[PDB]
Swiss-Prot record, chain B:
Pfam families: Ribosomal_S3Ae (PF01015). Component of the small ribosomal subunit (SSU). Mature yeast ribosomes consist of a small (40S) and a large (60S) subunit. The 40S small subunit contains 1 molecule of ribosomal RNA (18S rRNA) and 33 different proteins (encoded by 57 genes). The large 60S subunit contains 3 rRNA molecules (25S, 5.8S and 5S rRNA) and 46 different proteins (encoded by 81 genes). eS1 interacts directly with uS11 and eS26, which form part of the mRNA exit tunnel. N-terminally acetylated by acetyltransferase NatA. One of its GO terms (molecular function) is structural constituent of ribosome. GO terms for cellular component: 90S preribosome; cytosol; cytosolic small ribosomal subunit. One of its GO terms (biological process) is maturation of SSU-rRNA from tricistronic rRNA transcript (SSU-rRNA, 5.8S rRNA, LSU-rRNA). The keyword Acetylation applies. The gene is RPS1A. Residues 1-12 have a biased composition (Basic residues). This is Small ribosomal subunit protein eS1A. It comes from Saccharomyces cerevisiae (strain ATCC 204508 / S288c) (Baker's yeast). PANTHER family: 40S RIBOSOMAL PROTEIN S3A. SMART domains: Ribosomal_S3Ae.
Curated annotation (Swiss-Prot), chain E:
It is found in: Cytoplasm; Nucleus, Nucleolus. One of its GO terms (biological process) is translation. GO terms for molecular function: RNA binding; small ribosomal subunit rRNA binding; structural constituent of ribosome. This is Small ribosomal subunit protein uS11B. The gene is RPS14B. One of its GO terms (cellular component) is cytosol. Present with 3370 molecules/cell in log phase SD medium. There are 2 genes for uS11 in yeast. Component of the ribosome, a large ribonucleoprotein complex responsible for the synthesis of proteins in the cell. The small ribosomal subunit (SSU) binds messenger RNAs (mRNAs) and translates the encoded message by selecting cognate aminoacyl-transfer RNA (tRNA) molecules. The large subunit (LSU) contains the ribosomal catalytic site termed the peptidyl transferase center (PTC), which catalyzes the formation of peptide bonds, thereby polymerizing the amino acids delivered by tRNAs into a polypeptide chain.
From Swiss-Prot, chain F:
This is Small ribosomal subunit protein uS15. HAMAP family: Ribosomal_uS15_A (MF_01343_A). One of its GO terms (biological process) is maturation of SSU-rRNA from tricistronic rRNA transcript (SSU-rRNA, 5.8S rRNA, LSU-rRNA). It comes from Saccharomyces cerevisiae (strain ATCC 204508 / S288c) (Baker's yeast). The lineage of its organism: Eukaryota, Fungi, Dikarya, Ascomycota, Saccharomycotina. Component of the ribosome, a large ribonucleoprotein complex responsible for the synthesis of proteins in the cell. The small ribosomal subunit (SSU) binds messenger RNAs (mRNAs) and translates the encoded message by selecting cognate aminoacyl-transfer RNA (tRNA) molecules. The large subunit (LSU) contains the ribosomal catalytic site termed the peptidyl transferase center (PTC), which catalyzes the formation of peptide bonds, thereby polymerizing the amino acids delivered by tRNAs into a polypeptide chain. It is found in: Cytoplasm. Belongs to the universal ribosomal protein uS15 family. Its main location: cytoplasm.
UniProtKB/Swiss-Prot annotation, chain H:
Residues 1-19 are annotated as: Disordered. Belongs to the eukaryotic ribosomal protein eS26 family. Component of the small ribosomal subunit (SSU). Mature yeast ribosomes consist of a small (40S) and a large (60S) subunit. The 40S small subunit contains 1 molecule of ribosomal RNA (18S rRNA) and 33 different proteins (encoded by 57 genes). The large 60S subunit contains 3 rRNA molecules (25S, 5.8S and 5S rRNA) and 46 different proteins (encoded by 81 genes). eS26 interacts with eS1 forming part of the mRNA exit tunnel. eS26 interacts with TSR2. The chain holds residues 2 to 95 of 119 of the full protein. The keyword Aminoacyl-tRNA synthetase does not apply. Keywords: Cytoplasm, Ribonucleoprotein, Ribosomal protein. Present with 16300 molecules/cell in log phase SD medium. There are 2 genes for eS26 in yeast. One of its GO terms (biological process) is ribosome assembly. It comes from Saccharomyces cerevisiae (strain ATCC 204508 / S288c). The keyword Transport does not apply. This is Small ribosomal subunit protein eS26A. One of its GO terms (cellular component) is cytosol.
RNA sequence: GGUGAAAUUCUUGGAUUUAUUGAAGACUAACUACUGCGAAAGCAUUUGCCAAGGACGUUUUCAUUAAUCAAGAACGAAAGUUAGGGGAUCGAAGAUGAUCAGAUACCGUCGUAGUCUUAACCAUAAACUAUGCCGACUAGGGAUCGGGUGGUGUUUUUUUAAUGACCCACUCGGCACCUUACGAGAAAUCAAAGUCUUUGGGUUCUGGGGGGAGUAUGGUCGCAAGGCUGAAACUUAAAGGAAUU
């Protein structure tokens, strides 16, 4: 159900004589038998989990925590990474560019894994046949095949009904719409083909 | 176009210089005649006050006025206001810039322009990007009117220029660096070190612009303005 | 006519002939 | 003997799915099924396992990488930038 | 014994700007321009209108308290003209002859280090 | 000239008219011959043997001092390389560009130079095969080229 | 160069190839210099350094892989470590 | 027929140079082909220095001069009378 | 704000302008030249790495391994195409402002594709020096680029050694240039476009009046746009080149 391979990194419990097994998302360049140094005073190496408050600017990180003590919030998909932009000494906060392209400000005690999540470029090959899509979605959830609402009856969908296949009303649905009318574009600021820069 | 505007206010008196107070500027002790000038600022109110609105300011002056002499006219010193003391704003060194008249004057044709820059941190943690310029010269008795270089002496002098600037900046503070650029001793050091590669002329340092400022340290400021 | 405009005209005319060609062959 | 002159590996799909899609899946499948070599041993034995996993048969060391490539160009650039930053900061 | 300021005489075509500024640069005094004195929309940058515009900039500054200013005459800059406007030099003479002493004239026109592109196309402004 | 370039510069060695020279030379013919094989025993190519004997010893050229040439002496005493020296360096240069072109693929200038070197190697190999120096079935194999240079 | 020096040694002096043969040469003390590629396992490299330090020999590192070491030696296969039994007509023992 | 030995302008042995833009009509022209005139004119107009000197703080000594290099296209240079046509004998003159 | 003049458009919601910064992409002025390199296209910030190349110096080596080229192969401006990233200026289309009898043209303001880069295609140009490549000879003059040689030459560090940078003389390869016209050309002009009716150094390609026509068809390459090869029927007595008045 996930396109990113997993790596089983085991540590040593400092308080009890017992081996702890941890599940980490494998990063590119990480191999079996590799020693991973997770903590604050580690080195800037691929696979290490140093917090964002002790790394230079421009650092590429993965598995970024939104808040301290989160154990992985952002950049958990294959081929994605988070870019460090800057840090504020007073009121320690790190500024991050997310894979979406949205600026974020998080705490300096948020641990992140150095590197790029493995399995990058996964969505570059057409599924070609319906069998591949069926197998991919079976391991994820019951969301395939999807039936168009314009080909439905008026009772089974707001967009259905009529002697033809047309929506009838505007596809754009306001944000303050109750459950039932939200069938289409939700709070669509703009429509049509995205030509030119997105002004992000 | 006093009578061509159609829509003047789409929505539908007291002179503003009565609520403004003069503030006299002062300069580091590196420059002899402190005597910077005066600037306007809104009167100290309970909402925004005058110190906060005057705290961030960079005033540009000329080195000839600061030092009194006239051989520093082509160099203008930029001073940044960062703290006040009751109607006398105090500044600090922020950068140095060669005037457009001088820079375009030494830049002639039939000569080689040697340029270099260095990113160097001082003792007081002032990350500085220092620029330098140099032009090849026609030596005496020479009849060839191009006086060009072979692009290998340029690299050699560029390396010597970079290491000279690094040596004289790493191991000194911002105040010492300011007291070093005014006598133009760095130019003498370069012309002593790159005279065995190519004659060169018009050895100068272009910009000493600032990049990073350390902790405020109001203690150093009080030593600067004695 | 200019060489560019004459060549463009005959190229558009060739495109039209080939479009007519594709209908039968 | 060049059984297929242009179709190449994806002759299994036949005449279906479109020439452009067949070409794209051929371009990616060539690298997916290509044989690579261990950086820990040098023998050309690295082969693709699951998505993002590259395991071998001689050295048995498994590497995490791209879906169809043992080393993504973006990953290589990121590693180079990380090494440069580490060298700058630790000097 | 003399408070100082900055002229910032922006000289271009179809318009001219004289905007007296204090030493620091934040304060603004007498931003009058040459387009609010002429009623032709073609003499806004003419030397005859710059003198009238600068005749008021030297009086408001005197009333405010400024007696002398520095001069930084500039052009449109960027990648358009790089040359001073027709009336920029006339504006400097107007406030100099109005009793306002000047000094340290500077050229601060923005010269680009080969940035962006210049409007007009590869075949020029064919007129 | 310049088989694979547009240059036309002339620069070569101008040997003297004296076929019996340099008169002031005093060492014996056998003394220089054992010096040639001693330098050849330590992997020096015939060009370097002549270069070293010309600037360090009093041997102007090994043709008038001896009765034969350097390569001729090497073959007679059994220190002749399997492949010609000029071909050996050409193949050595060829694998250098191939090594350069296996990492930086976007270098079209190296690709053009590599083709020129490979064409030059093939032309030289044709003459050597014709003159009965290399095996008649000898060929330049890109994969085996690195092994040939040893 | 190091490649030319190794080729000269292979041509003239006595050489042995492989890891077990290198260990045997170190044990018998017939080895002077050993060259280990930068691609060998770290455990094997460390044991080779231990044997070299016990036998008072010299250690050199080939900045490549087993393929590159074999190519420099003059062999088609992969060489992880080469032990230099006799210098021969070369100078790799005295210099570098 | 051929007019000049240097066909466009001053280009023998290069084949291609980075073009420049005219300052008047924004026409794209080769850097060699462009006709360049250097302006050394003073920052002030003709005369009027004596008016400036009386209202000049410090002992004057400023007298700045603006320096600019202007590139003109063939059409604009002829139209602006900067470059004028000549006879065939005068064409060869440099 | 802009134009010859205007207008669209932006301006009490502060336009334009000024001062302190930040972000994004593009680009490599001035130095920049009858200057350099590269097979051509082409290449201008600094530093590091990788391999490559011309010239020069050489009493080093091989030895005729060479020159030109059907077929065939590599590179090949811009524009265009496929799939991502990027997308600030300019800007095929398009939307408006005008001018004009008409203006979906020139001018003004916006603006998509594109302009940048990654991987794969496109094989075109006034891709021109409209002048194929190799070799030999032939009127003089100066400047300049790279290397080399000589002159107690000048300057430079420690006045004075070296080296470096300059002056003079010479040499090899260059980008080229000035004056003449033995000689050539229809002339314009040419140090080759000369050494061709005193016709022969080696080799490749192309053209046989102007249109039809680089069109039609047949092959071939390409995702397409298009590239390569490539007619005939029919029509005309003229087109075309250089100069003179």
């Amino acid at each position: 159900g996930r396109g990113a391979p997993l790596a089983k990194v085991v540590f040593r419990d400092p308080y009890k004589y017992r081996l702890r097994e941890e599940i980490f998302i494998a990063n590119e360049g990480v191999h079996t038998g590799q020693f991973i140094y997770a903590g604050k005073k580690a080195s800037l190496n691929v696979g290490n989990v140093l917090p964002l408050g002790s790394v230079p600017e421009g650092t590429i990180v993965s598995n970024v925590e939104e808040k301290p003590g989160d154990r992985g919030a952002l950049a958990r998909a294959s081929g994605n990474y988070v870019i460090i932009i800057g840090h504020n000494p007073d009121e320690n906060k790190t500024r991050v560019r997310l894979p979406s392209g949205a600026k974020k400000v998080i705490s300096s005690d948020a641990r992140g894994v150095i590197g790029v999540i493995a399995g990058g470029g996964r969505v570059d090959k057409p599924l070609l046949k319906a069998g591949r899509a069926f197998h991919k979605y079976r391991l994820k959830r019951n969301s395939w095949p999807k039936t168009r609402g314009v080909a439905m009856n008026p009772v089974d969908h707001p967009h259905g009904g009529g002697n033809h296949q047309h929506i009838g009303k505007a596809s754009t649905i306001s944000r303050g719409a109750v459950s039932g009318q939200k069938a289409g574009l939700i709070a669509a600021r703009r429509t049509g083909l995205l030509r030119g820069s997105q002004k992000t | 176009a006093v009578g061509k505007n159609k829509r003047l206010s789409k929505g539908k008196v007291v002179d503003p210089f009565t609520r403004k107070e003069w503030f006299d500027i002062k300069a580091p002790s590196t420059f002899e005649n402190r005597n910077v000038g005066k600037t306007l600022v809104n009167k100290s109110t309970g909402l925004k006050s005058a110190s906060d609105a005057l705290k961030g300011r960079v005033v540009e002056v000329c080195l000839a006025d600061l030092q009194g002499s006239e051989d520093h006219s082509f160099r203008k010193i930029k001073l940044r206001v960062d703290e006040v003391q009751g109607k006398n704003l105090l500044t600090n060194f922020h950068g140095m810039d060669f005037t457009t008249d001088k820079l375009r004057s030494m830049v002639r044709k039939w000569q080689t322009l040697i340029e270099a820059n260095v990113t160097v941190k001082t003792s007081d943690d002032y990350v500085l990007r220092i620029f330098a310029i140099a032009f090849t010269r026609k030596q005496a008795n020479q009849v060839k009117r191009h006086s060009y270089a072979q692009s290998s002496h340029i690299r050699a002098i560029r390396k010597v220029i970079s290491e000279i600037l690094t040596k004289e900046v790493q191991g000194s503070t911002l105040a010492q660096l300011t007291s070093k650029l005014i006598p133009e001793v760095i130019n003498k050091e370069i012309e002593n070190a790159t005279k065995d590669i190519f004659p060169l002329q018009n050895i100068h340092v272009r910009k000493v612009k600032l990049l990073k400022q350390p902790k405020f340290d109001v203690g150093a400021l009080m030593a600067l303005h004695g | 006519m200019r060489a560019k405009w004459r060549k463009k005209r005959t190229r558009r005319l060739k495109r039209k002939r080939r479009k007519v060609r594709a209908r039968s062959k | 003997a060049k059984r297929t002159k242009k179709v190449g590996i994806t002759g299994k799909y036949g005449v279906r799915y479109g020439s452009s899609l067949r070409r794209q899946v051929k371009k990616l499948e060539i690298q997916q099924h290509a044989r690579y070599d261990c950086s820990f041993c040098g023998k050309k034995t690295v082969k693709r396992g699951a998505a993002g996993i590259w395991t071998c048969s001689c050295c048995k060391k498994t590497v995490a990488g791209g879906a169809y490539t043992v080393s993504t160009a973006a990953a290589a650039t990121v590693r180079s930038t990380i090494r440069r930053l580490r060298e700058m900061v630790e000097a | 014994s003399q408070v100082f300021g900055v002229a910032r005489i922006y000289a271009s075509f179809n318009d001219t700007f004289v905007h007296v500024t204090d030493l620091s640069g934040k304060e603004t005094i007498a931003r009058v321009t040459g387009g609010m004195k002429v009623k032709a929309d073609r003499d806004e940058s003419s030397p005859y209108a710059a003198m009238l515009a600068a005749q008021d900039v030297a009086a408001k500054c005197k009333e405010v308290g400024i007696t002398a200013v520095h001069v930084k005459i500039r052009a449109t800059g960027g990648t358009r003209t790089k040359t001073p406007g027709p009336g920029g030099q006339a504006a400097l003479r107007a406030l100099a002859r109005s009793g306002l002493r000047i000094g340290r004239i500077e050229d601060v026109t923005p010269v680009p280090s080969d940035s962006t592109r210049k409007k007009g196309g590869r075949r020029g402004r064919r007129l | 000239g310049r088989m694979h370039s547009a240059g036309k510069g002339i620069s070569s060695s101008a040997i003297p008219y004296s076929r019996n020279a340099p008169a002031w030379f005093k060492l014996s013919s056998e003394s220089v011959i054992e010096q040639i094989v001693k330098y050849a025993r330590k992997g020096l190519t015939p060009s370097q043997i002549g270069v070293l004997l010309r600037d360090a010893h009093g041997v102007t050229q090994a043709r008038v001092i001896t009765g034969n040439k350097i390569m001729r002496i090497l073959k007679s005493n059994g220190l002749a390389p399997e492949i010609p020296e000029d071909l050996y360096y050409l193949i050595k240069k060829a694998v250098s560009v191939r090594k350069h072109l296996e990492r930086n693929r976007k270098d079209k200038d190296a690709k053009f130079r590599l083709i020129l070197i490979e064409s030059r190697i093939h032309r030289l190999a044709r003459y050597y095969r014709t003159v009965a120096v290399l095996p008649p079935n000898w060929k330049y194999e890109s994969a085996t080229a690195s092994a040939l240079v040893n | 160069s190091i490649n030319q020096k190794l080729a000269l040694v292979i041509k003239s002096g006595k050489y042995t190839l492989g890891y077990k043969s290198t260990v045997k040469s170190l044990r018998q003390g017939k080895s002077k210099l050993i060259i280990i590629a930068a691609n060998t396992p770290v455990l094997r490299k460390s044991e080779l350094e231990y044997y070299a330090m016990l036998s008072k020999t010299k250690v050199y590192y080939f900045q490549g892989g087993n393929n590159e070491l074999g190519t420099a030696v003059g062999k088609l296969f992969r060489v992880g470590v080469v032990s230099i039994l006799e210098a021969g007509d070369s100078d790799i023992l005295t210099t570098l | 027929p051929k007019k000049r030995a240097s066909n466009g302008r001053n280009k023998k042995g290069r084949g291609h140079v980075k073009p420049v833009r005219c300052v008047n009509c924004s026409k794209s022209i080769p850097k060699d082909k462009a006709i360049k005139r250097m302006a050394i004119r003073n920052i002030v107009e003709a005369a009027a220095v004596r008016d400036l000197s009386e209202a000049s703080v410090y002992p004057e000594y400023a007298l700045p001069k603006t320096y600019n290099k202007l590139h003109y296209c063939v059409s604009c240079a002829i139209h602006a009378r900067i470059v004028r046509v000549r006879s065939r004998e005068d064409r060869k003159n440099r």
